Amino acid sequence: ATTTATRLTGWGRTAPSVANVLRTPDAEMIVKAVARVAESGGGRGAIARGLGRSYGDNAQNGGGLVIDMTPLNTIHSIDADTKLVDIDAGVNLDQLMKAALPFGLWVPVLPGTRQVTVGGAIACDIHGKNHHSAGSFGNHVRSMDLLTADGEIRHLTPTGEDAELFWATVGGNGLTGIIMRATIEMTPTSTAYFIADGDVTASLDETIALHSDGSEARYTYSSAWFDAISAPPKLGRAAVSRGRLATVEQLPAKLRSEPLKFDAPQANKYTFGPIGELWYRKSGTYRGKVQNLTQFYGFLQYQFVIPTEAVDEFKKIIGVIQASGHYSFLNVFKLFGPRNQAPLSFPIPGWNICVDFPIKDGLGKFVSELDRRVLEFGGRLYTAKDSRTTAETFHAMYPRVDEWISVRRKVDPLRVFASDMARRLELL
Numbered sequence: 421a422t423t424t425a426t427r428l429t430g431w432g433r434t435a436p437s438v439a440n441v442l443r444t445p446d447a448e449m450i451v452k453a454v455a456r457v458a459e460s461g462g463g464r465g466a467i468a469r470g471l472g473r474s475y476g477d478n479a480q481n482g483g484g485l486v487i488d489m490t491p492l493n494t495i496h497s498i499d500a501d502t503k504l505v506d507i508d509a510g511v512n513l514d515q516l517m518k519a520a521l522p523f524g525l526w527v528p529v530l531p532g533t534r535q536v537t538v539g540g541a542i543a544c545d546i547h548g549k550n551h552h553s554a555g556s557f558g559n560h561v562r563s564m565d566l567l568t569a570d571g572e573i574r575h576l577t578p579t580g581e582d583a584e585l586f587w588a589t590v591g592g593n594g595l596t597g598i599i600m601r602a603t604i605e606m607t608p609t610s611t612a613y614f615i616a617d618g619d620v621t622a623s624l625d626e627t628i629a630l631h632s633d634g635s636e637a638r639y640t641y642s643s644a645w646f647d648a649i650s651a652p653p654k655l656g657r658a659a660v661s662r663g664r665l666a667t668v669e670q671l672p673a674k675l676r677s678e679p680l681k682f683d684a685p686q687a688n689k690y691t692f693g694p695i696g697e698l699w700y701r702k703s704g705t706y707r708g709k710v711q712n713l714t715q716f717y718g719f720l721q722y723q724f725v726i727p728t729e730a731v732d733e734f735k736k737i738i739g740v741i742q743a744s745g746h747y748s749f750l751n752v753f754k755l756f757g758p759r760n761q762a763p764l765s766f767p768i769p770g771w772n773i774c775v776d777f778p779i780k781d782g783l784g785k786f787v788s789e790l791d792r793r794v795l796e797f798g799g800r801l802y803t804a805k806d807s808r809t810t811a812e813t814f815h816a817m818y819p820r821v822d823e824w825i826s827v828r829r830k831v832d833p834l835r836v837f838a839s840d841m842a843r844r845l846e847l848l
């Protein structure tokens with residue numbers, strides 16, 4: 421059960437702060453470290469940390485305590501009939517995926533890396549390319565055990581009398597206490613494969629029409645790479661990949677007797693002319709391609725969603741980005757579906773995009789301009805990717821914030837739980 425003053429950052433490796441980190445596999449010692457912060461209560465307080473994949477400052481606490489939950493990584497049970505897994509909060513999604521597959525069960529929401537803990541997937545209420553059909557990760561949690569500031573472990577359910585604290589802890593960025601353990605309901609599957617259709621669009625307008633014509637209703641998973649650099653009309657052209665979990669009949673014969681296996685890793689004169697355009701189109705257009713899951717897996721990361729109805733507003737912000745002087749090559753676009761009841765949950769239905777800007781003069785100020793425009797158009801930023809926006813902005817993007825903050829003040833009156841993000845965004 422060691423303790424180390426550590427200089428910590430998020431994945432973005434910005435805004436370092438030093439904390440004492442507790443790393444221990446012993447649950448009892450975590451309860452005690454908490455009571456310990458509470459008795460002197462509460463100085464700089466404490467926050468859980470999972471694997472450190474959020475890009476900003478939610479899993480750091482400058483001059484306070486950070487409890488590394490990764491050692492608490494026990495899988496208690498998996499059951500193919502009830503579809504439930506019961507696991508410690510430090511278990512990660514890659515470990516869970518691998519452990520659940522032989523039961524014909526699939527992690528119901530996967531983000532773009534599986535090096536995330538169950539505790540961080542709940543705390544950021546993460547989403548994946550199936551958001552429009554599955555919701556976000558908080559939708560699939562049937563119970564959790566929350567170590568609260570008074571040292572009790574509350575067992576929370578999404579419809580019990582403890583439903584308000586449950587729903588504050590989904591998306592709550594660890595600020596209601598330390599999730600110790602959870603029960604997640606899994607998606608049944610007969611294979612570890614996808615069958616997928618690709619399409620390429622020529623412009624933002626076409627990208628939007630493809631997402632609005634109803635074709636999305638055929639696919640449980642959908643996302644696209646998106647050009648945010650080309651001037652119009654090329655601006656907003658995309659490479660769209662959509663699909664569903666394959667059934668065993670859909671696998672080729674070769675793959676059929678091991679359907680539930682994860683596989684192991686690991687002309688230029690035409691390129692810019694019309695023959696290159698044709699080739700790119702043909703090559704991103706395909707139907708029913710079978711692919712294993714293992715197939716899929718300095719900079720300011722920026723992600724926002726704009727409500728579905730605000731479509732011209734969304735095209736405007738894309739136009740603003742392209743005209744801005746800041747170039748993002750790696751852009752992921754998708755259309756989110758219905759939101760959940762967590763007050764601080766990020767996903768709303770509408771047009772989500774992740775963009776990644778090279779850090780260079782003028783970007784801070786430009787991104788503050790983006791914040792204003794995302795706000796004014798009904799949208800928000802995602803805490804898992806932020807270490808810069810202001811409290812005023814954040815509070816206006818999230819209109820249920822005061823409701824959440826009153827839940828938090830009930831469960832943690834003395835501020836035992838605190839983080840750099842909590843202080844910057846005035847979530848205490």
Ligand SMILES: Cc1cc2nc3c(=O)[nH]c(=O)nc-3n(C[C@H](O)[C@H](O)[C@H](O)COP(=O)(O)OP(=O)(O)OC[C@H]3O[C@@H](n4cnc5c(N)ncnc54)[C@H](O)[C@@H]3O)c2cc1C
Pocket residue numbers: 431467468469470471472473474475478479489509510530531532533535536537538539540541543544545546547548592593594595597598599600804
């Ligand atoms: C390459 C990359 C791709 C990504 N893609 C996506 C994506 O597609 N969709 C998406 O939604 N996100 C995505 N993310 C973000 C990532 O899913 C989230 O930031 C996830 O929360 C991080 O998990 P973690 O265990 O590392 O948590 P950490 O970053 O260590 O902590 C983040 C938050 O969770 C809290 N937390 C962690 N464990 C606990 C616990 N046991 N109890 C209470 N609170 C806890 C922390 O206090 C902090 O507020 C991506 C990140 C990377 C680096």
Ligand SMILES: *N(O)c1cc(C(F)(F)F)cc2c(=O)nc(N3CCN(CC4CCCCC4)CC3)sc12
Pocket residue numbers: 531532533547548549550642643644723750752753754772773774775
């Ligand atoms: N936005 O970042 C985003 C959104 C979504 C969606 F909303 F569609 F679910 C999915 C999503 C994702 O599945 N993966 C992402 N990343 C993993 C792959 N990336 C490429 C790497 C490799 C090169 C260098 C760093 C980036 C980007 C992040 S993001 C994402």
